[PDB]
Amino acid sequence: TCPFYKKIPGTGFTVDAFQYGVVEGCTAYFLTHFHSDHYAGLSKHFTFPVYCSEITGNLLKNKLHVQEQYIHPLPLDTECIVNGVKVVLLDANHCPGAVMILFYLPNGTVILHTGDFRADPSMERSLLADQKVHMLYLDTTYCSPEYTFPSQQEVIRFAINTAFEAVTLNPHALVVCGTYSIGKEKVFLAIADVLGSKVGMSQEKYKTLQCLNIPEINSLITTDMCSSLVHLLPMMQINFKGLQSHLKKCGGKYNQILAFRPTGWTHSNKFTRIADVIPQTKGNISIYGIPYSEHSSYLEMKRFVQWLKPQKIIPTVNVGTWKSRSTMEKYFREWKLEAGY
Ligand code: NI
């Protein structure tokens, strides 16, 4: 049974609600992004209307085989009428194709559902500038002040400088980057660009990247592993055993691996600055955990909410424990008292 924080009142609509069977009263199912916790339940046998971005619709058709007649892509930043209700899709600054959804209810209420997002001051100059929001359905993944991490730009600067140094010292080093979902593609694209290489990967991952509308992608990636000195591997293989096993397969081309594991937040962010980050090393293998986040930091979240001044907030993450719920409610009241809304 579908929980309340996935239903949009006063509509026939649900958000990221595909794992509950046929939801009573649902005339259109929205999908904010192509991450498995959110699409859980979709397949080629789904027969209700799915509303989403163009890039999410390419993934639904090619990766999950949803039939074309049930896929309804909408452009971004454009007022659209769905089943008699005005909606707008906005870029979420999460993974490729990820959106927030603005719903303009028949009774005059305006609802924003953030999906998963990384808040940014640029969102203060989207179509959000123009009107009031009554209810905010908020991605609260990192809603606590202990959750600090650098800008994506600082993280990428570290990765490129680290990879370029290593390979210039040793032209026989291979660089490996872990992946398990879409998102964070700048990690492996920026490293391959500084090294003058395409990124090599499995047929299954190449297919996924081909659905993402990235400019000049055919110039940036390949399935010919022999031609590339940046390889992608499943995140589960990014360990000393997996990396040893990969280096064996490379036919004596390489004598060293430098690997990256993009994570979200980890508790080493409480102590160590990005610039001071060091790897774990065994022999000719070194692994860097880098804190590349596609969710808001606490401070980014706080800024966005204090600017938007919503009348009510409904969290969509960390909702399963009383302690998490109580913590989040306390921060929402602080933010409201501090800003005066
Ligand atoms: Ni996500």
In whole angstroms, give the CA distance from residue 92 to residue 114: 7
Ramachandran assignment for 213, one of left (phi > 0), alpha (psi -120 to 50 degrees), beta (any other): left
Same domain, 274 and 162: yes
Q: Are 29 and 2 in contact (CB under 8 A)?
A: no
Q: Which helix (H) or strand (E) holds 286?
A: strand 285-291
Q: How close is the Cα of 35 to the center of ligand 1, in Å?
A: 5
Instruction: Give me the number of domains the chain comprises.
Output: 2
Same domain, 153 and 78: no
- Residues with Cβ < 8 Å from 123, sequence gap 6 or more? 90, 93, 304
Domain of residue 135 covers 1-147+296-341
Backbone phi, then psi, for 129, in 5-degree steps? Answer: -65, -35
CA distances in angstroms from 333 to 268, 295, 310, 338, listed in the order given = 29, 22, 12, 8
Q: How close is the Cα of 292 to the center of ligand 1, in Å?
A: 13
- Residues with Cβ < 8 Å from 58, sequence gap 6 or more? 97, 211, 212, 213
Task: Provide the pairing of β-strand 99-104 with 110-113.
Answer: antiparallel
3-state secondary structure of 301: helix
In whole angstroms, give the CA distance from residue 328 to residue 243: 40
3-state secondary structure of 12: coil
Hey, CA dihedral for 266, 267, 272, 273, is it positive or negative? Answer: positive
Same domain, 5 and 87: yes
- Residue 89: give its domain's CATH number: 3.60.15.10
Q: Which of 267, 263, 306 is nearest to 136 (CA)?
A: 306
Same domain, 214 and 251: yes
CA atoms within 13 A on the CB side of 124: 12
- Residues with Cβ < 8 Å from 67, sequence gap 6 or more? 44, 61
Same domain, 25 and 128: yes
Residue 15, judged by CB atoms within 10 A of its CB (0-12, 13-18, 19+), counts as: buried
Same domain, 300 and 334: yes
Q: How close is the Cα of 248 to the center of ligand 1, in Å?
A: 34
3-state secondary structure of 156: helix
Q: Which helix (H) or strand (E) holds 164?
A: helix 152-169
Determine how many CB atoms are found less than 10 A away from the CB of residue 119.
Answer: 24
Q: How close is the Cα of 254 to the center of ligand 1, in Å?
A: 35
Q: How close is the Cα of 95 to the center of ligand 1, in Å?
A: 7
- Residues with Cβ < 8 Å from 228, sequence gap 6 or more? 192, 197, 198, 199, 200, 222
Q: Which helix (H) or strand (E) holds 158?
A: helix 152-169
Same domain, 114 and 217: no
